[model samples]
Target: MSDAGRKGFGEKASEALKPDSQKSYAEQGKEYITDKADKVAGKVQPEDNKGVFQGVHDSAEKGKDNAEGQGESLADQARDYMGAAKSKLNDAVEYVSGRVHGEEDPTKK
Candidate 1:
């Protein structure tokens, strides 16, 4: 392989076999949010001062719609994506507990 290429046969094959359309979590999140934001922004009219809510009326209906509709669902779905994250963080606390208990290794593999 060259300097900028995969170093192994299997790695190259894996890259080729993988789906080209696959987007990373952050990329997906950005697109998903930006698309929805654009849609919502289009529906709402410009406001007086162009504060954060320049896009919404006094009731902040645009922000409220974005929050209760799209934002809430996005936040709810985030929990499924954070499964292993919680376990890894909990291990850090457990390790400290084990140290207090005088155990040499307190981490879960």
Candidate 2:
């Protein structure tokens, strides 16, 4: 009511009040990524967080792990396809290689 923190609330209007949590959602996300990078780069080790921020940190960690799981799945799918393609290619090469010597195509027949 006072200080009128709204659009045209009054001549004393000001910006909306911002929360003072140690780790807001966005801040926690940034912190998580930066800390991950730092850990990867060998510049830091895992540090114990001691408050509500710990929950946020854990959520980010789970999200990162889930993404890695999905990546591994996608890579497995790609590897399977590559193997299938390689087999077809090998068979084609075999036929083409033998064609110069008048061998019939085995798959076609």
Candidate 3:
């Protein structure tokens, strides 16, 4: 594919990744809601990608100490799980929605 195609696909992927979006609501519903809650429970996942990359190891290690990091109120393992989620777009919601709702799996511009 061309550069334009790759860029377009990247945007679509990012949109589909947001906590609240067409796919998240229309397809996943409760599962999406649950995963999104778990994904950013403490605002630990930095908005900027650079921070995500720079301190991810330490942040994750900290999570293992007590899932109750910052604002999570969870145990260390839970915090660790939450931290691990940053690298992922909680597909649990997407998978559930696609299976339950039989979605069209649309991609946007």
Candidate 4:
């Protein structure tokens, strides 16, 4: 049916909205560990002739920024999926309740 085609299109659109390129979970974990290590190293050796600690700290700060950006995108993707699931649930409940009450099916046009 044409309705099935429309449903497929919607699924594809939703998939496109949540593309998977926002840093893998394992990578984020590694970043967190390295970032923490850098902070600790900076604290322990705050002074050096070559400014090594400062450079490490700066790189850690940059990593913090990138990690936060990735985390925000992940959270946004989760929220979007949650919203979609809630909408689908609502429609299903509405359809079932309407059917039990002898009302027209809410899902079918």
**Best candidate, lDDT:** 4
Candidate 3 local lDDT, 1-109, one digit each (tens) = 1122233445565465556445446665677567556546544655753344434544553433445424322244344666778646466767767776575545456
**lDDT (CA) per prediction:** 0.56, 0.53, 0.51, 0.61
TM-score of structure candidate 2: 0.29
Question: Which ten-residue region of model 1 has the weakest summed lDDT?
Answer: 65-74
CA displacement after TM-score superposition, residue 42 of candidate 2 (Å):
50
lDDT of 2 by residue, 18-96 (tens): 3444536878779868977744444323464235454455455554233331211233444566799999999999898
**Residue-wise lDDT of candidate 1 within 4-85, one digit each (tens)?**
3323553655565565455476687788778777656665656632345534543433453333322123233344557868
TM-score of each: 0.22, 0.29, 0.18, 0.30
Error of 2 at 77 (Å): 0.9
Query: On a 0 to 1 TM-score scale, where does candidate 3 land against the true structure?
Result: 0.18
**Top candidate, metric TM-score:** 4
Residue pairs with clashing backbones, model 2: none
Candidate 4 error regions (>4 Å) = 1-72, 103-109
Which 10-residue window of candidate 2 scores lowest in summed lDDT?
Answer: 1-10
